[PDB]
């Protein structure tokens, strides 16, 4: 082999998040929505303006999906709730592992045909504990079982596809997908084995060529494989325990990186103070707007 790029990029926001996650980008607003999972809040960035708010929520939410330009669906450890963007309520959706409080959701992604895929992990990564759910008009599927931290969710361009990973694994898989539900037509396959490999295989987007570009936690990275699966270039970020990579800006043409503190010592932040924080690579990307997710 992959080519280095060294991290030529910004800073998008300074503030340090414990464990930052489930990034996604809204057009119509021109604002990136992110979360902090452990301290159970929504982060809103207006990207133009640099406008920071911070939203308090009563769960750990993990994913955002967008319903109409005054509805959102968030993913939490406490099932699937609609949010009203003007007044911040927050209404149950579909339960969600609502009964299992040992519990919490993860990484999520929408696919084209307007289903939600949603992980679930133990709270302490439990070996097996997790699984990915497909959640459609509110009806929730578990497609896989017995993964310890679900990640990496994502479709390809047509949204044939859809690979996910186990992080505790390093194996990312490709599932053949009907294109009109985003439910598997087929097993799932090893399509990168990244076993062994140091770091973990976190948070992906697909590009509009297909490409996957993958965080990589604990080697400050976010990793791009061509269609066949080679690796092809790592781009170097400040925080090392890389999460998750979003789409933004007008064209969906630059990538946001967020970051984690969870875990690391407080030697390790003073050593580097950009552990956790949220940033936007200095590269073009040819990306795509997250689907909307179909009441
Ligand atoms: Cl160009
Ligand atoms: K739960």
């Not at 992959?2 to 998040?17: I, K, Y």
């Not at 963007?85 to 990484?107: F, I, K, W």
């Not at 509009?208 to 170097?236: F, M």
């Amino acid at each position: 082999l992959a080519t280095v790029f060294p991290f030529a990029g910004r800073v998008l926001d300074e503030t340090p998040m414990l464990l930052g996650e489930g990034p996604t980008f809204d057009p119509a607003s021109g604002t990136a929505w992110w979360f902090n999972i452990l301290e159970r809040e929504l982060h809103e960035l207006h990207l133009a303006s640099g406008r920071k708010t911070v939203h308090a929520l009563p769960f750990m939410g993990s994913a955002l999906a967008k319903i109409s330009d005054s509805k959102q669906l968030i993913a939490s450890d406490d099932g699937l709730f609609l949010r009203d963007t003007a007044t911040g309520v927050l209404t149950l959706h579909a339960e969600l592992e609502s009964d299992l409080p040992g519990n919490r959701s993860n990484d999520g992604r929408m696919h084209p045909s307007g289903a939600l895929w949603i992980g679930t992990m133990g709270r302490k990564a439990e070996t097996g504990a997790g699984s990915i759910y497909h959640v459609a008009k509110g009806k929730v599927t578990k497609l896989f079982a017995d993964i310890s931290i679900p990640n990496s969710i994502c479709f390809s361009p047509d949204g044939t596809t859809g690979y996910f990973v186990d992080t505790k694994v390093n194996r990312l898989m490709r599932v053949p997908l009907d294109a009109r539900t985003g439910l598997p037509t087929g097993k799932a396959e090893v399509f990168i084995d990244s076993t062994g490999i140091k770091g973990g295989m976190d948070g992906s987007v697909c590009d509009a060529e297909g490409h996957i570009w993958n965080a990589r936690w604990g080697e400050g990275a976010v990793d791009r494989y061509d269609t066949d699966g080679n690796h092809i270039a790592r781009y170097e970020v400040p925080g090392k325990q890389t999460t998750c990579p979003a789409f933004i800006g007008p064209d969906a043409s630059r990538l946001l990186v967020t970051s984690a503190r969870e875990h690391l010592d407080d030697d390790a932040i003073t050593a580097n103070p950009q552990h956790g924080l949220t940033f936007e690579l200095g590269i073009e990307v040819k990306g795509r707007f997250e689907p909307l997710y179909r009441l």
